[PDB]
């Protein structure tokens, strides 16, 4: 073989070039930075009314509204301040696995096992929420809808590919391929010109929304990557493995910045989120408890011990005022 | 505290939303959610037709005052089973495997499938209805040769029913724990409503047994 030898030596030497210039670990420098003590957060709100496992949840751009989707077949929009149900939408397929909130607040997108991403319009002149679009063309179950504009949306799937869709036309504007397994989560960058997606192949990658280019690839896990999120400054991203360890990678360094793992944790991370200052990495686990890690020293600075079942989705508001968490008991909890 | 004319109207709307959510959930609990499974080229467009009538394919058929929901899986291609747990609480798993399964080795794939759902923490306490529907080709290919072609476990006489018992006999060995769940195997002639009735009976027997565990008797 010729190309295989070139491919093998390319990666080994490219990694060698990365290793040669690799100076030191994050801890080696940030050791002198004092910890944050104990972040004891109390459950300020308990949003109840879902009658099944809650699979997805997305914060509003104004830091006050929430969307949650259940196996019940319902999509509920809450007022996070007064724990009031602003909207309740019946979804076509009860098998929801992801949801997103339009950054302008006009629309809401949700999808799941039926391979279709349904986009509903909230601000209708007739007062009810209708289905503006049904983005179809994926050949597998859907995940991590992430609106870019009111007329451009990304979607991951179990087809080993992500897709950028022009909602108005309903045609896949771009298709990012290269995965060898179901793609579980994607998270748009702050500037909305990139994104990172992790897949069951135990590898994630940074894709460009404009040119459909596999700009970067990232490895280091030993099992699936069930959750992913972006550092608030759009220069790092943390993935939540089913290996029971979280990993913060830097886009530029081509390497994992650090690992958040503890011996007592034997189960995989279900969702990952960040604090507005990029200090508290919030990891929802299968242990039926979330967990607040100090995102620079890897210490569990507090825990959001709640829910009777595994945590599925986390979210930190835009201003960082709260933390919404969901779990398979059908209760959302807003912690502060 | 006193509330604004609007902030009260917001609270009244939430109650109306809350009422409908609760009311809808009551209707959901009145249905029987049967997860439908099958192996490759086993015959899956013939049992669904017998009922009273892309990814997931959900089917409805109301039979004798029961509203049945049957969720097919022949649309999903990714076999990672990161979506099986979504099918917790199903009242059964209608697993369809026919006798002509060694025409396309079936032993490894078939036994690995059943060992998968009997090992899953989510399904180990749900009954598995086993279907062997037709009787039109189940006899004409048994006489070709003993089952040593792909089933080394048995090297004896191969009749229709006796060998059929062996497949069932080895089957229960797949079930790692028969304390909680129960296989309801079916050997019939796919000529009439036989299939529908058997699931109804296997659905009453699983429901009635579930009540007792709630009463603490069974």
């Amino acid at each position, epitope marked *: 073989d010729q190309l295989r030898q070139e491919a093998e030596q390319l990666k080994n030497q490219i990694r060698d070039a990365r290793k040669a210039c690799a100076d030191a670990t994050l801890s080696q420098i940030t050791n002198n930075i004092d910890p944050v003590g104990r972040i004891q957060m109390r459950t300020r709100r308990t949003l109840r009314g879902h009658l099944a496992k809650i699979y997805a949840m997305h914060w509003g751009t104004d830091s*006050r509204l929430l969307v949650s989707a259940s196996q019940d077949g319902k999509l509920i929009i809450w007022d996070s301040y007064t724990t009031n149900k602003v909207h309740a939408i019946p979804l076509r397929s009860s098998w929801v696995m992801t949801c997103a909130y339009a950054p302008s607040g006009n629309y809401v997108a949700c999808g799941g096992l039926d391979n279709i991403c349904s986009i509903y319009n909230l601000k209708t*002149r*007739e*007062g009810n929420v209708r289905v503006s679009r049904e983005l179809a063309g994926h050949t597998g179950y859907l995940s991590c809808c992430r609106f870019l504009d009111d007329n451009q949306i990304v979607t991951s799937s179990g087809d080993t590919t992500c897709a950028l869709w022009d909602i108005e036309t309903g045609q896949q504007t771009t298709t990012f391929t290269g995965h060898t397994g179901d793609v579980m989560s994607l998270s748009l960058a702050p500037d909305t010109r990139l994104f990172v997606s992790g897949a069951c192949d135990a590898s994630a990658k940074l894709w460009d929304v404009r040119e459909g280019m596999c700009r970067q690839t990232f490895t280091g896990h030993e099992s699936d990557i069930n959750a992913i999120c972006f550092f608030p400054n759009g220069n790092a991203f943390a993935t939540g493995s089913d290996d029971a360890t979280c990993r913060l990678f830097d886009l530029r360094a081509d390497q994992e910045l650090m690992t958040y793992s503890h011996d007592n944790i034997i189960c995989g991370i279900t969702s990952v989120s960040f604090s507005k200052s990029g200090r508290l990495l919030l990891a929802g686990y299968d242990d039926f408890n979330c967990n607040v890690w100090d995102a620079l020293k890897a210490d569990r600075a507090g825990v959001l011990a709640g829910h009777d079942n595994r945590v599925s989705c986390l979210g930190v508001t835009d201003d960082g005022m709260a933390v919404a968490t969901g779990s398979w008991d059908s209760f959302l909890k807003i912690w502060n | 505290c006193t509330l604004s*004319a609007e902030d009260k109207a917001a609270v009244e709307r939430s109650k109306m939303i809350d009422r409908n959510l609760r009311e809808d959930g009551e209707k959901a609990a009145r249905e029987v959610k049967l997860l439908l499974l099958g192996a490759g080229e086993s015959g899956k467009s013939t049992i669904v037709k017998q009922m009273k009538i892309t990814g997931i394919v959900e089917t409805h058929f109301t039979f004798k005052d029961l509203h049945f929901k049957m969720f097919d899986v022949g649309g999903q291609r990714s076999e990672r089973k990161k979506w099986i747990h979504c099918f917790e609480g199903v009242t059964a798993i209608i697993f369809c495997v026919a006798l002509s399964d060694y025409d396309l080795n079936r032993m490894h794939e078939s036994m690995k499938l059943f060992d998968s759902i009997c090992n899953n923490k989510w399904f180990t306490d749900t009954s598995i209805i086993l279907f062997l529907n037709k009787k039109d080709l189940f006899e004409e290919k048994i006489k070709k040769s003993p089952l040593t072609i792909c089933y080394p476990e048995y090297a004896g006489s191969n009749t229709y029913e006796e060998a059929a018992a062996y497949i069932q006999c080895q089957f229960e060995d797949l079930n790692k724990r028969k304390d909680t769940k129960e296989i309801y195997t079916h050997f019939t002639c796919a000529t009439d409503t036989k299939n529908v009735q058997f699931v109804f009976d296997a659905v009453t027997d699983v429901i009635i047994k579930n009540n007792l565990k709630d009463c603490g008797l069974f």
Partner: single-chain antibody
Amino acid sequence: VQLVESGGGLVQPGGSRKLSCSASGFAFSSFGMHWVRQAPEKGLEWVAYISSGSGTIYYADTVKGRFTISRDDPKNTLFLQMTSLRSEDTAMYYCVRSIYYYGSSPFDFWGQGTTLTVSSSDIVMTQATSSVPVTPGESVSISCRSSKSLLHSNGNTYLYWFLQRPGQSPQLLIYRMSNLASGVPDRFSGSGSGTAFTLTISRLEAEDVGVYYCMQHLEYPLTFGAGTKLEL
């Protein structure tokens, strides 16, 4: 959306009539309804309210217990049955919808109104004047005063601005003193704090003439301003 009311006409005192508001084009059951009225060339005046689900009902203190409001949601037909009408109940009765949740414009659409004629504590909202001549291209500022401070602890200043062009029905412009309504040009802008409030119209157009109105929704009963008329 199209709300059309029927039931207007001339009725002698002491009788009883019924006004229907046959809705078409929206989710009737999700909208609370009002029956704002207007006496001839005097000003607007609220009449009744009926929330979604027919749970809440409020009446104006002038006719409380004399009018009754009923909503027929499966049919999309709202009623207001007036029992005893005096010589003061003559007015143009409008049928207004209102949807209350976090971020709604709860006075967005106003029906076409119906003419009803009869033969012969509360917050007070005051408008400074009754006529203001102006020419196109000149920015204008209208202001009305309130008795209490509308700024609720929430922060919402429940002040509503309407515009009744000659021969038409009102049309919301500012639903909470700073938020533009739907479908109105973005030149309108509202401000003001405490009791005082002002509406500023930059780059006034020819069709912006009409009797403006300011209404409060901090607490029932709903009260309307006297009415400022822009003249050209």
